[PDB]
């Protein structure tokens, strides 16, 4: 299958309440594996998956120094961005960075990413070519000129095509028991009377990994997208995810309705119905 | 593993 690695970073300034808080996390696919929080006492990057724990002290030292450096760059960048947007020093602002790579079933690079946002909006992004930039506004154009002059994109390309892919391949092997296992949804349909005239049928998908899933209702083989309540996929807290889809049905018509479930972990897509 | 960010905005 195809896989991804991402590092997410957020600094939030808090004028009059010390230096910004900095939090970064790393994921492979939908699995958190490392974390760093600047407000921890003597902060270190820490493992959050079993398969990364085997990395040696030199790995944790380098990671932690990278994280502390990123917090420091962010502090300077938050100051700079106040100037670029003609903002007062009184308010809290946010700086976000994501980077990483996608690989295919063969382990080859599919796409690399590096993008920044200020106050929840795009600032500057590396394009898919890993060679040119998209600046969101005239402020980010100042950054773009600075980063073009310094050949930043060339550095990112080298990381994203090389280490990002190589280390992701390493993690997928070391974590093969979990990262390369899809857990199918456990599914069932429940029935929730509204009145003597209608009831809700709710189709449940529980315990699945990764998070990607499709849940639909049909009535006599026709989709019911407009009349379906579909909740956002949500974490269970044990690596897995949950989702449900619900439709309101006239009393006595329940056997017309089928729920359809597609997920990577299932031997075959499911068709389920309410079973009194 | 991560990369170092080197350049400020």
């Amino acid at each position: 299958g195809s896989h991804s690695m991402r590092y997410f970073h957020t600094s939030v300034s808090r004028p009059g309440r010390g230096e910004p808080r900095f939090i970064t996390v790393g994921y492979v696919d939908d699995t958190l594996f490392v974390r760093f929080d600047s407000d921890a006492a003597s902060p270190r990057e820490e493992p959050r998956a079993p398969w990364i724990e085997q990395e040696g002290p030199e790995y944790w030292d380098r990671e932690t120094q990278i994280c502390k450096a990123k917090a420091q760059t962010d502090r300077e960048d938050l100051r700079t961005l106040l100037r670029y947007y003609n903002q007062s020093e009184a308010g809290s602002h946010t700086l976000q960075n994501m980077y990483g790579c996608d690989v295919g079933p063969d382990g080859r690079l599919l796409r690399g990413y590096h993008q920044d946002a200020y106050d929840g909006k795009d600032y500057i992004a590396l394009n898919e070519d890993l060679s040119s930039w998209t600046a969101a506004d005239t402020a980010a154009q100042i950054t773009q000129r600075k980063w073009e002059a310094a050949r930043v994109a060339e550095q990112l390309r080298a990381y994203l095509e090389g280490e990002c892919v190589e280390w992701l391949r390493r993690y997928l092997e070391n974590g093969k028991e979990t990262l390369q296992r899809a857990d199918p949804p456990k599914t069932h349909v429940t029935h929730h009377p509204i009145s003597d005239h209608e009831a809700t049928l709710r189709c449940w998908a529980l315990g699945f990994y990764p998070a990607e899933i499709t849940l639909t209702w049909q009535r006599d083989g026709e989709d019911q997208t407009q009349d379906t309540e579909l909740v956002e996929t949500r974490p269970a807290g044990d690596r897995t995810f949950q989702k449900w889809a619900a439709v309101v049905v006239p009393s006595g018509e329940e056997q017309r309705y089928t729920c359809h479930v597609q997920h990577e972990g299932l031997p075959k897509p499911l068709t389920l119905r309410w079973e009194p | 593993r991560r990369r170092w960010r080197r350049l400020t905005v």
Binding site: I23, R35, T94, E232 | -
Partner: protein, 100 residues
Amino acid sequence: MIQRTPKIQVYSRHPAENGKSNFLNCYVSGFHPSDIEVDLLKNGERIEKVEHSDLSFSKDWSFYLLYYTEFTPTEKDEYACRVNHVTLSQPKIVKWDRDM
């Protein structure tokens, strides 16, 4: 500055069975800015020592967090999640319903 109000779901890790230990989750997502206050409530009162995930965000930059605690559902006990955010004039309370 553009702000986005949290989506909120309150739910259990496993299907609820009265008298059986479980986890109560409140998942907040789709919000900006990141500062947010979340309580889990048992019969109206704040549950102590609730844990949460580390701040992360989606492709559109909006934030998400999971707050959670171990709990043993019963017939009578009422659970809820209370959320405050700058986008809200008063705190939002969402009741736990074992069928959602």
